[PDB]
Amino acid sequence: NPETNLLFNLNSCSKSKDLSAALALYDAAITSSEVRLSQQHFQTLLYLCSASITDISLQYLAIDRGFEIFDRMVSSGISPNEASVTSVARLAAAKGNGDYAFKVVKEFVSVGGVSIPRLRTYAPALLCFCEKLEAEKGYEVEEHMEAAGIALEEAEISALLKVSAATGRENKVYRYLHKLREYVGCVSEETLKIIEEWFCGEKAGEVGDDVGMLREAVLNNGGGWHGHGWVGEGKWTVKKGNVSSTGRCLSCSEQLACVDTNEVETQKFVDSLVALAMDRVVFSEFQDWLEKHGDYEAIVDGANIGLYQQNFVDGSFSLSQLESVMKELYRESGNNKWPLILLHKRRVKTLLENPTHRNLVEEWISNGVLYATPPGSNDDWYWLYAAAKLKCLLVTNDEMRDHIFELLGSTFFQKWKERHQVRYTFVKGNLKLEMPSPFSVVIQESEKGSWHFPVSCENNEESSRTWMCISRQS
């Protein structure tokens, strides 16, 4: 059987990255006319041609003979899959042909059946245009990506920022300094140098505008950014320097913002939370109970605080620790609001039928500062909902890492936990609440057009992270 032998030998070439050998077998199949060409033969060759772009000894062969393999695949009556289109997009981008790398994807997305065009399909085009300082054709790829419903990562956004800085398009540079802020957060060392080069450059110091109305724009957006135009005269003062624990940069000596988590994104969180919670008993009775009587500054994971530093074997529970968390949050509250504790019905009873505790537990149920979550369903979803919907603190020592709560948007979560979650500790006797930080680690604009960029300390992120401060002085 010749078809199985060709597929077996082409795979043996792909294991060694031996393009020369597989590309010889490709000729033997065509000229002899003994073997039936098929999708898996064409695919194996195209991936190998894309794989060989990095190899110096095999790149010239892949670029010369790669497109003929793709053209034979289409004319044989086989539509090209996502990986095959990406392979030719990379091959075309390797020899500076951005327009073919673009239009090979436009044909693919135009079918729209089972295409599924990933970012790696469009990236060969986009990067090739930004390499050749073709800003206009670069931005076309972004439009066709964003319309096709594909997220841009840091590398693509940095490429578009780079080409904007090269062509001197100060409108577009401002666009992508907010795309990084929005879709990335803290930036790379390479990405930081792309930004540093702009603000140090002469074009950046030829832009300007007001004071009063921008304050509303900062508040309405969240706190991080005002989001329209540059502010100042010229000559930026770029410098790297660390930030305080209180949210105060040592370079410029101004206040960093603690940005509110996205209001529309928080509504997607709570709806997906109620959707999973409504699953066999009535969850909706808590929803209205919170809304009717619930204006607390903090929520407490009752099961966590009580079982903290207790033996899993003994089944020992600690109301005294849960009592301490109640009193300290009440003190730290300015208006003096007691937090809402959320325990199970199995844990509230047994606490209630202990005569020592009964009074204190009954007191909290009467005052509306403790809610019993019903059996069967988890308490997990009740205190997530309570803190998230009311937008307040959540006291628990539990970084929620699991595949049951996998609908957690890990982009939105962590970013939510850093703003809202309160950790704690009981050193022998006394309690110590570890509050969330008074400033967020994200890109942000001041009212005076002063930017701040945090660089991602990938190894050991701490208070000694370097921030790249950029201000005007006017």
Ligand SMILES: [Zn+2]
């Ligand atoms: Zn600063």
